[PDB]
Amino acid sequence: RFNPEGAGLTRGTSAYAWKWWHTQYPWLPNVAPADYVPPSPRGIRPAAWDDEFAD
Amino acid sequence: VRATEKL
Amino acid sequence: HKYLAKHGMDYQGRVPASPAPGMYQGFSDVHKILANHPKPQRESRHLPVMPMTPRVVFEHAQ
Amino acid sequence: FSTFALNPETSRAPHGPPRGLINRYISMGLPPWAAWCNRVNRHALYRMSDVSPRSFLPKAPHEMDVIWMNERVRERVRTSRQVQHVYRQLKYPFVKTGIHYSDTLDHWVQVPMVEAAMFEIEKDGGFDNFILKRSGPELRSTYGERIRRHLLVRQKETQKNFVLDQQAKALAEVTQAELMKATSEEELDAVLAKYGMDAEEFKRLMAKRVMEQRKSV
Amino acid sequence: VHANRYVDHDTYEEKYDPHWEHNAHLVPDQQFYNIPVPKEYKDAYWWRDLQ
Amino acid sequence: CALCHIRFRYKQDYEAHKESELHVNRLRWVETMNWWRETGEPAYLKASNEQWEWFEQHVLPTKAQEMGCTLDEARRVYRQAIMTETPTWHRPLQCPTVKQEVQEPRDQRWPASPKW
Amino acid sequence: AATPGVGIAPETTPVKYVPEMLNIQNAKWWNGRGKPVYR
Amino acid sequence: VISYKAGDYHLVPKKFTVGKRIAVRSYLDRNRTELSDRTFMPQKNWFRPY
Amino acid sequence: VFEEETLRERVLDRVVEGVFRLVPTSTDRLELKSVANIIDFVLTHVTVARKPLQHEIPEAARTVMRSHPLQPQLGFVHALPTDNRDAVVQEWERMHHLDWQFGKAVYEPRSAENERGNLTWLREVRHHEAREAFQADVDSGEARRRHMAKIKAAAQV
Amino acid sequence: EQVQDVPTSTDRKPTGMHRGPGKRQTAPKEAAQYQ
Amino acid sequence: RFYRPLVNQGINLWRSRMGRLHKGWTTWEYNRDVIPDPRPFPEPAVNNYFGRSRIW
Amino acid sequence: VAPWVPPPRHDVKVTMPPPPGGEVGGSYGVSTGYSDRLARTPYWKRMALSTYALRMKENETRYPMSPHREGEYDLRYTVTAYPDHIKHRPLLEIGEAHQIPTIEIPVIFLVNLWDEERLTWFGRQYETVYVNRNVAREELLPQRYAIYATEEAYKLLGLPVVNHSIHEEIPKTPHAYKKLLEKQSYTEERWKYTIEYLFRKYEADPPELQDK
Amino acid sequence: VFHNAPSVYPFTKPFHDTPYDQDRGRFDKTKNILRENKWPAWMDHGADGTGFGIGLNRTHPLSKLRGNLRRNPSEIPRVLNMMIQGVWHKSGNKLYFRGGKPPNPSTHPYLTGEPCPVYGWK
Amino acid sequence: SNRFFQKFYLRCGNCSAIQRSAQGYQPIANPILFKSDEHCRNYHDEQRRAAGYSGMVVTCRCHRCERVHSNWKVLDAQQFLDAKLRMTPEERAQRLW
RNA sequence: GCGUCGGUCUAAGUAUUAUAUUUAAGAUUAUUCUUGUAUAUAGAUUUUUAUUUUAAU
Ligand SMILES: [Zn+2]
Questions:
Q1: Is N96 exposed, middle or buried (0-12, 13-18, 19+ CB in 10 A)?
Q2: CA of F36 to C1' of O50 (A)
């Protein structure tokens, strides 16, 4: 009875969300791919953005 | 940076 | 709804059957969100193969 | 019980062992509601002498959440109206939304606590101390153990953020002996380059300070 | 085991505190013989010491 | 009549409301509260000041030499806390009656009643 | 399908009607499964 | 001196509270009429850093 | 909603390629179709650019924090309670300001502390000023005496 | 006592929106205020 | 002592009408405390069967 | 299964059992402590490790009181090992109405605070004021204007330790409070009850003999 | 004992009805979530349409391979329903148990490897 | 209320003068015309004194600093011997009687 | 069971809607009058009938 690709679903949950109810899975929050790490202030600058622009 | 701020 | 939007017209032609490869990929028990057709394919160009659902195999057994 | 108007206090029963029926149940420690028992069996005067109270906790003490300081759900035996039916019922305590300001973690924190905790908090000097001098099985909460942890960190962070003021004053003191004269502003770079406490950060920081001498006047 | 450990500013690891193990309250376990925790954090485990 | 949360269903009483024992009494109460705020309180806690500071300058000097201590120290032995006073927190207003009415037997009996 | 028989109390007062409120005897040797928990 | 007229602070910020008391929000106060922009405007995404 | 290709290319070459000189992949160009998402895509690839703050210390100041008497305990961050579970079920609970509520606290690492009314701060600034006072003895030597007076009280007995 | 003319009412909005006996009249905490 | 209570007769008979749902059973008589066993009595855990459908 | 069953709580003494649990912080309900370390070591062993001058220090009978839970009776001599019900009674007894009135607590102000509505002082700096229980908690404490006036709060600040008996007893009735206001009006604000303050009216001429 | 939940009386009682709620117990139904099962997917539903991999796969201690022959009290209700009921696959053929003598999962040879489509077993 | 005799050993807070103040026999309010509030709060209050002045402010006049205050710490009589036996024979003349 | 109608509901669902009912569709019509429940109400009871409920001897 679920409809994945339903343009609701908060786009993170399309398999966690066939459960949970008909009256809750719209609100199921966006969290992460569970492997996406926080945005990290690392030093990798785009390949050609360069300094002057970066500075 | 705290030792900085005293001065 | 995808010809009307991209072409500005009613399709005004017989729609192809056998849904295009890549459509209804998250669905699992389509069988209703389709005709009783099989889950179309992956988004590939490999020759069509019936995804041997427990149902298709039974028809072979008939 | 005596009948005179003004009965000044005295060492012992002035007129013999106190007469009356209700004085009979007080002479043995019972409360004056024993006068209304129809049967006073050896268990009854045990039951009502409150040797061990017939009174329990709503959830398991190992899984309790709302901070019930020293309370139970005591059952109150009521006798009904005109035709005296005796029925009993379980009377709870009054749990308030304890929305306190524990200045350890410099922010409000809410833990629902019985009224009796909202008094014994103020008797303890703060909300956090009431969390801190109680101990585990005594403060049988679960929220009290999630907020004791943040309390134990955000205390050992203050103590840590204190020794900063003793490792910073050490530098500030010991570097002043090298900020001694304003001869060279090329040298103020070198003393700052010595402790790697750069100039561009310090210069304007002192500037903001003399402006703050003008911001505070 | 890492609570209250002087980080030494050479190896940036915990210095070996000889006192720590005395203010340590060994909370038991099933998959571990007796996990040691400092004294201040002992009461959060008040149920496992009862189990 | 939002003052007292009254919807009026019958006319001829919406008229007789303004002097009703409900309105006129709710008028007095919401007024004397204003009285307290308008004049009273800014003057009540005015006198409460002008007597304390009188004390800590006209009496506490000599009192501090009685404890053998310093003047500033006594301001924490003769006022351990400043219990200011409100409408909501007056202790009593009048010292209860000293001469209590004399008990009697039950129903004007005499010279003694066998009953209670 | 199931039944607690106690009837779900208010979410605020989680326990009304302990079985003792009715002068019930629940010895482990009398009805078996007896002995209560608030004990 | 530090002036203070009372009727101030109400510890909890003025959004998460009624006059006094933090207010309850439980996905039943909320409508489904918000969250209905999803039909065109897609939900937020976590773009992984390259 | 920047959906129609004609509109996305009209924005992406100008703002994310032109102004910022960023370049988005194909699979992200899909969801990169709103003012909300354009802002985030930048605000990740520019946050992954700040050189990670370099904790570099000098030497002359380094020997100060070593020889200094009072050192930091510095392990407490672990005592903090863990809320590890499915990211949703953990996050669904914070449907509203369930944050500071029920013995939780959004612990943001704090580097300076307010000194007024802070009991746990005055609770030690006196204990410290009780350590500088005791330390005065060992400086002068009245500790050794008052300590050598015990053993001469505890010898003849 | 000369202050016993307490108005048998008070400004406080009556809790208990519905209706009933005992509404909108003085309380022994309010009777000590006006006193 | 625990005095015999006269449960069957007397007031304790009529008290059931006088607002008393639970008329207790005499749990002082059987007071020899050794457990009975339920009438749907369990059979021992030994697999009595020795057919070809004997199950592990 | 229990690998390494923990040792008894307070087993630290050489020739007497550890005090019962609960008293040390544990589970109540049992009176007599026991530690298998002590009961296994033969008698001479227990008499080896200890001299007579010491056993008389751990024989020591603190008879009614408990040596550990300071102020409460030893829980191996009560009727049953649970804590004293009477001392820690819930504030409401099994039948009374909750008429616990509004109570005002003492707080030590930490900054010279000056109301802008009554145009006077909520409180000077470092002077204890009796403020409302829900001004203090909700307005004075969250901002750093005040703290409670407990004994140790005085110790931390630098003030002579004063015992306000902060909530030493809560009153369960208004007229049971308006007596407690009379006790607290005497100890705290004592200058109200001097022979000099009962006679400001008369420090000079009875007013009927002065000029006009 | 319905209310073994985090006591929150004036607020919203999170999850209250959801999959992951408290106040529903531990060994309850309504735990379809917990579909995560150590046993490989293919041995509880066949690797293909004919329900190939279906069965009870005892495994050797040393072998890292995981089999669904559990004997936990929570798992024996289904391990009997394999030995006495058997599986009726939706393709028409009856699986692991189809006739008279019910198998003995504990006297099976050990699971040697997961099935592959091209060959039989990797 | 009170029915049984008990003498406490109150320690002042101003001078720490351990003075003892007893509690005589004050008879029960009359049961003949019973009053439920005055009785059941006479009793419940009696456990609160009997347990060493648990939930009450103690108001007795000192003997050392002649004044009546509310600063007394009620000493259980084995915390008193802890104190009495541990004072030099002169300060027993100062703090005790 | 459809319709009509009565009542309820604009901080969980669209007030030509969905709850909560009484009737029965279609076609004609749907009369006279009120002592109580309900509503509204004003410390409450006691009073008190726009619509609704029940009533009309
Ligand atoms: Zn004294």
A1: middle
A2: 47
